[PDB]
Nucleic acid binder design. Structure first.
Ligand SMILES: [Mg+2]
Ligand SMILES: [Mg+2]
Ligand SMILES: [Mg+2]
Ligand SMILES: [Mg+2]
Ligand SMILES: [Mg+2]
Ligand SMILES: [Mg+2]
Ligand SMILES: [Mg+2]
Ligand SMILES: [Mg+2]
Ligand SMILES: [Mg+2]
Ligand SMILES: [Mg+2]
Ligand SMILES: [Mg+2]
Ligand SMILES: [Mg+2]
Ligand SMILES: [Mg+2]
Ligand SMILES: [Mg+2]
Ligand SMILES: [Mg+2]
Ligand SMILES: [Mg+2]
Ligand SMILES: [Mg+2]
Ligand SMILES: [Mg+2]
Ligand SMILES: [Mg+2]
Ligand SMILES: [Mg+2]
Ligand SMILES: [Mg+2]
Ligand SMILES: [Mg+2]
Ligand SMILES: [Mg+2]
Ligand SMILES: [Mg+2]
Ligand SMILES: [Mg+2]
Ligand SMILES: [Mg+2]
Ligand SMILES: [Mg+2]
Ligand SMILES: [Mg+2]
Ligand SMILES: [Mg+2]
Ligand SMILES: [Mg+2]
Ligand SMILES: [Mg+2]
Ligand SMILES: [Mg+2]
Ligand SMILES: [Mg+2]
Ligand SMILES: [Mg+2]
Ligand SMILES: [Mg+2]
Ligand SMILES: [Mg+2]
Ligand SMILES: [Mg+2]
Ligand SMILES: [Mg+2]
Ligand SMILES: [Mg+2]
Ligand SMILES: [Mg+2]
Ligand SMILES: [Mg+2]
Ligand SMILES: [Mg+2]
Ligand SMILES: [Mg+2]
Ligand SMILES: [Mg+2]
Ligand SMILES: [Mg+2]
Ligand SMILES: [Mg+2]
Lengths: 130, 199, 80, 156, 134, 87
RNA sequence: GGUGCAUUAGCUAGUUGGUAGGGUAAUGGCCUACCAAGGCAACGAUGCAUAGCCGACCUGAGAGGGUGAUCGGCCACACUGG
RNA sequence: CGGUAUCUAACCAGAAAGCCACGGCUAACUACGUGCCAGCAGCCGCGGUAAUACGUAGGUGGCAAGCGUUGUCCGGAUUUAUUGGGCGUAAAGCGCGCGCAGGCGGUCUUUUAAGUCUGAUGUGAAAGCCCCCGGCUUAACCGGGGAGGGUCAUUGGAAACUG
């Protein structure tokens, strides 16, 4: 319905608040890209792609630090169906003063803020996560 | 000068012995007027910031509008705001004349600059607010020359700061290099004047 | 040489003689919110002799003023 | 040691058949410039007793402020009750710009370059609670790097 | 509201009315019309003088005046200071500023700018009330 | 079309721009293309000029004024223009 | 691309297009005769009210808000109308 | 312009300081007079016999050849909230439904470059803000160079996302 990426972010947010360890949801290309990015920056622990003959699903394990500390402290959606947001190469933002990351879809695929500013390319910003 | 009133009054009200060494505060360290030897009152943040502004303004003896203009111009520089403001305040010709030994207070330096008794690079200057640079020299252009007042001022002049070099054979002084906040007043809190101008 | 402006639109009214009306649509940022909004403007084009039919996408090109309000000529008809 | 400052005192009342009874409630912020600060409330028939009780209360709920390079690492917002305080980093030599209670708590904490704004109600206790709450979700590069299993240079 | 609701109709501010309308317009005799020109002070002609009573809890009598302005406006002004040399058919200079004590008075009278006189035996706040240095 | 001299600066302190413009326009108003500066106060006159656009304008029919002619003569634009006409 | 009103909903007929002609430095219902009934409008037509336009000025953390003093560029007017 | 700027000598502390404010907001208090009168006032409000708020005197604070008052605009005002608010009880969900236009739209592949991102060319006058240099004894002021500013036209690129 309308926005699946917002549903993705809301699922991780709810599971993080509940201190859940495992999450599953239907899969797509952009969902797999977001999960792979989050795994690269270590926000999540692991991600698996389970094959079912409707669309396939993705399962992510939430990662918590020592003494039950939340690794992911917030997810915000920037681009929306009612208002799209596009950022230039010199307009890409720094999430949480460099402590967090942003996801941007540019002409070279999905990248983070560091990759986008390294190649001097721009795209549309999808979300902030910190 | 800007203001020709009593000098012990402003120092006594301010709480510090500016333009001297405690001699204005030897007796009755309380504020002037009939109130102050009786009791006191509380002090808020606004009072402290205004007190620091008065510290600077009556320490360097320059009017309020010129003070704010100098602060604004110092904001143009690069570095910490208050340090740059203070070091630009230290660039005044009056301050250089006073701290160089040619006078004893700010008023004496200001009057001796107004009459053109000094000169920079052989140019008579009647502007006390002239901003000296590195390598600029000072002299007496043989006007006062063998004057009693300048001899007395050189007699009782404490010492010379390490950022200015002066020789008395020809009464020549020049800024060695830029002074730092480390070699400055330190009776003030420069972190409050910026906030006071920030409201 | 130089070049003239070309617009691709859809024929709306072709009931004039040797001339038609074409709507051209484009999107634009808003003044304060930055949202896409449809923006349709109607031009008048000139054909050879009544070829274009209503609801057929056509490309038209700029030219001199042919009439009181007529500044475009038909370049071709892309499809119906 | 521990330096303290008085924020506000309020005279509250309660009705009885013989009249009314009043007492003073005092808000006190304590802290040292090393990076530790706290707040407390006291209540007594006399103001100095209220101040002493507020100091004793404030001494029991101390917190810590990350103050890397004498500046907040990144902007944060508090949300306690009906008060809102937004804290953001400032350049060196910019001083501190804040409201009364927020100025007090930031000065006692030890920071020197930070700018804040009040976006909610102006009740002093709620303002202090919002400021402390906003200080809660501060971060350090080393801590998040340890959380994500990488180094500071990789992260920054 | 949603972004579409905002593009369909945008936000609007609230029109804030002034406090001293009589200072905000002039009169044209050729067209016999009223024009929007804002002025700091104006001048007018007195019609009557008197002293009215305030609302609760105040009871002291206050000196006021009724004036026809340059645009023929019935304007009730206040007389500051101690004592005055005002009466009917006198030229007065009206200035902005309302008093809460009187429910209708909205303007003050400058002392020493016109037919109006100053205040005798005034040492402090001498710039107002129009008294020269003694 | 004349390569003219535009005056600005301050009271009793004039400074001049060598500029090309039409004779029907105001002295300080619309112009075409500035080419140089001229400072009279200094005893040795400091005149900077492009010396390349000036020759193009002279070729295209831009007659200078008396002082502009003197400056072009001293800086060698007039002599080089004569040489170009001969060659 | 830069204004208020829908308690201002229909406006227009040389208007809309064409065939010939006249006129101008030049295209053009700019003008004439003939032929058909068109054209614009809730993406605000028509009407009422205010207003010269811009580079720019004041304020503001910024986004924005207010204004068009001096100077520079464009436009309109010269007691009213032809 | 004009004996003008400027410079050189002799005399002179002599010929040159005022305005507003002082209960809180907001820096700075004592006495006398008056007694809900005279009056002050942006607000909280002061004045009925012990007035730090009315008038004066002394004192103190701010600014300075200026200081106060008024009128207009912006801020504070998140008090039209895109940045940056809301609708159980404080103002705020139409009494409900069917539905045109409009807004938005599950998954994958190929293709297009309308949106999107980027390189080059031309242009966005001068003066103005800003940065670096200078010239006036300093400053205001003036001069040189540079930078900024567009959903701008021509054109070459990429195809993740919307179409
Ligand atoms: Mg800066
Ligand atoms: Mg053509
Ligand atoms: Mg408790
Ligand atoms: Mg008074
Ligand atoms: Mg000549
Ligand atoms: Mg504009
Ligand atoms: Mg405008
Ligand atoms: Mg013809
Ligand atoms: Mg008009
Ligand atoms: Mg100006
Ligand atoms: Mg603001
Ligand atoms: Mg203007
Ligand atoms: Mg004029
Ligand atoms: Mg103009
Ligand atoms: Mg005329
Ligand atoms: Mg006339
Ligand atoms: Mg003469
Ligand atoms: Mg002379
Ligand atoms: Mg003599
Ligand atoms: Mg004599
Ligand atoms: Mg004399
Ligand atoms: Mg003498
Ligand atoms: Mg004297
Ligand atoms: Mg005087
Ligand atoms: Mg009084
Ligand atoms: Mg006095
Ligand atoms: Mg005084
Ligand atoms: Mg401000
Ligand atoms: Mg606003
Ligand atoms: Mg909103
Ligand atoms: Mg609200
Ligand atoms: Mg709702
Ligand atoms: Mg209700
Ligand atoms: Mg209902
Ligand atoms: Mg209802
Ligand atoms: Mg319904
Ligand atoms: Mg629809
Ligand atoms: Mg889709
Ligand atoms: Mg320019
Ligand atoms: Mg100009
Ligand atoms: Mg210089
Ligand atoms: Mg300038
Ligand atoms: Mg310049
Ligand atoms: Mg320049
Ligand atoms: Mg720039
Ligand atoms: Mg594809």
């Amino acid at each position: 319905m309308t926005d699946p990426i917002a549903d993705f972010l809301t699922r991780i947010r709810n599971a993080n608040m509940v201190k859940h360890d495992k999450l599953e949801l239907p899969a797509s290309k952009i969902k797999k890209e977001i999960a792979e990015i989050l795994k690269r920056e270590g926000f999540i622990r692991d991600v698996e792609y389970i094959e079912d003959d409707n669309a396939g699903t993705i399962r992510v394990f939430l990662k918590y630090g020592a003494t039950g500390e939340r690794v992911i402290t917030g997810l915000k959606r920037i681009s929306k169906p009612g208002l799209r947001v596009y950022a230039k190469s010199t307009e890409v933002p720094k999430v949480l003063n460099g402590l967090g990351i942003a996801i941007v879809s540019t002409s070279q695929g999905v990248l983070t803020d560091k990759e986008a500013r390294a190649k001097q390319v721009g795209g549309e910003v999808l979300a902030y996560v910190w | 000068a800007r203001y020709t009133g009593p000098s012990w009054k402003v120092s006594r009200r301010l709480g510090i012995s500016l333009s001297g060494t405690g001699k204005e505060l030897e007796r009755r360290p309380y504020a002037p007027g009939q109130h102050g030897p009786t009791q006191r009152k509380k002090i808020s943040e606004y009072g402290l910031q205004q007190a620091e502004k008065q510290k600077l303004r009556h320490m360097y003896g320059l009017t309020e509008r010129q003070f704010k203009n100098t602060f604004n111009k110092a904001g143009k520089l690069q570095g910490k705001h208050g340090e740059n403001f203070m070091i630009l305040l230290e660039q005044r010709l009056d301050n250089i004349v006073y701290r160089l030994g040619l006078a004893r207070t700010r008023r004496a330096a200001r009057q001796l600059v107004n009459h053109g008794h000094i000169t920079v690079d052989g140019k008579r200057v009647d502007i006390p607010s002239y901003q000296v640079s590195v390598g600029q020299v000072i002299s007496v252009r043989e006007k006062s020359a063998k004057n009693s007042a300048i001899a007395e001022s050189l007699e009782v002049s404490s010492f010379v700061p390490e950022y200015v070099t002066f020789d008395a054979e020809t009464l020549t002084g020049s800024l060695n290099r830029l002074p730092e906040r480390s070699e400055l007043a330190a009776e003030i809190n420069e972190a409050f004047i910026v906030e006071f101008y920030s409201r | 040489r130089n070049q003239r402006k070309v617009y691709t639109g859809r024929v709306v009214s072709d009931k004039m003689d040797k001339t038609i009306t074409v709507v051209v649509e484009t999107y634009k940022k808003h003044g304060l919110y930055g949202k896409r909004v449809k923006y349709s403007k109607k031009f008048k084009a000139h054909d050879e002799n009544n070829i274009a039919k209503t609801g057929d996408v056509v490309r038209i090109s700029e030219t001199r003023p042919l009439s009181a309000t007529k500044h475009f000529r038909l370049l071709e008809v892309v499809e119906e | 040691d521990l330096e303290e400052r008085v924020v506000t005192i309020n005279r509250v009342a309660k009705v009885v058949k013989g009249g009314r009874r009043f007492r003073f409630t005092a808000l006190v912020v304590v802290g040292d410039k090393n990076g530790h600060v706290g707040f407390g409330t006291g209540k007594a028939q006399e103001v100095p007793d209220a101040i002493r009780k507020a100091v004793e209360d404030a001494k029991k709920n101390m917190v810590f402020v990350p103050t890397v390079d004498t500046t907040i690492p990144h902007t944060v917002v508090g949300h306690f009750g009906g008060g809102e305080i937004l804290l953001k980093p400032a350049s060196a030599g910019s001083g501190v710009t804040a409201g009364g209670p927020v100025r007090a708590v930031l000065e006692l904490a030890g920071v020197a370059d930070v700018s804040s704004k009040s976006l909610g109600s102006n009740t002093p206790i709620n303002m202090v609670r919002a400021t402390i709450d906003g200080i809660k979700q501060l971060k350090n590069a080393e801590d998040v790097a340890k959380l994500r299993g990488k180094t500071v240079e990789e992260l920054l | 509201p949603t972004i579409n609701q905002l593009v369909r109709k945008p936000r609007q501010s609230k029109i804030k009315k002034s406090t001293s309308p009589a200072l905000n317009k002039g009169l044209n005799s050729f067209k016999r019309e009223l024009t929007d020109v804002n002025s700091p002070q104006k001048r007018g002609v007195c019609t009557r003088v008197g002293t009215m009573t305030p609302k609760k809890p105040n009871s002291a009598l206050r000196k006021y005046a009724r004036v026809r302005l340059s645009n023929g406006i019935e304007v009730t002004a206040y007389i500051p200071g101690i004592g005055h040399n005002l009466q009917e058919h006198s030229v007065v200079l009206i200035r902005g500023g309302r008093v809460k004590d009187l429910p209708g008075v909205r303007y003050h009278i400058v002392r020493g700018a016109l037919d109006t006189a100053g205040v005798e035996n005034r040492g402090q706040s001498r710039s107002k009330y129009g008294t020269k240095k003694p | 079309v004349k390569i003219r001299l535009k005056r600005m600066g301050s009271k009793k302190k004039p400074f001049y721009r060598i500029v090309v413009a039409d004779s029907r326009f105001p002295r300080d108003g619309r112009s075409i293309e500035t080419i140089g500066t001229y400072n009279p106060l200094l005893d040795p006159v400091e005149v900077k000029i492009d010396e390349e656009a000036t020759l193009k304008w002279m070729h295209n029919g831009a007659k200078p004024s008396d002082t502009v002619r003197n400056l072009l003569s001293r800086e060698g634009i007039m002599e080089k223009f004569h040489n170009q006409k001969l060659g």
